[PDB]
């Protein structure tokens, strides 16, 4: 069974637009979808789908590119560090779990490290 996915909206939070979070959508978000091994991470995790009843008994702050994405396209977002959160969420879910050496955490680990040289730098506000 599937919980509701992470809200994209929340109208009594504040938005924001600023130079890092346009990067962190145009190129870093963008650029990672295309990965080959961006296809998991590009939903919430379809636990009835996937046959993962267990998926949400263990996650409980799930997280997926396609709300990451939806978030920055609505500025969502108060600031970079807000979004960059998500994305770490998003990977930490994957490592918790499943094991090392999974097919799943090698595709995980691969656009962790991307994501990261992307973000190394960031544009000046
Ligand atoms: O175990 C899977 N997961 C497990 C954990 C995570 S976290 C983000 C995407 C996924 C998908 N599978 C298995 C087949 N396709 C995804």
Avoid at 79 to 86: K, L, R, V, Y
């Amino acid at each position: 069974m599937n919980p509701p996915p992470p809200e994209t909206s929340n109208p009594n939070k504040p938005k924001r637009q600023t130079n890092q979070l346009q990067y962190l959508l145009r190129v870093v978000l963008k650029t990672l979808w295309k990965h080959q091994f961006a296809w998991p991470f590009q939903q919430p995790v379809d636990a009835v789908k996937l046959n993962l009843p267990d998926y949400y008994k263990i996650i409980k702050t799930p997280m997926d590119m396609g709300t990451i994405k939806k978030r920055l396209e609505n500025n969502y977002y108060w600031n970079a560090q807000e979004c960059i959160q998500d994305f770490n969420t998003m990977f930490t879910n994957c490592y918790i779990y499943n094991k090392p050496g999974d097919d799943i955490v090698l595709m995980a680990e691969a656009l962790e490290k991307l994501f990261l040289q992307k973000i190394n730098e960031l544009p000046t506000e």
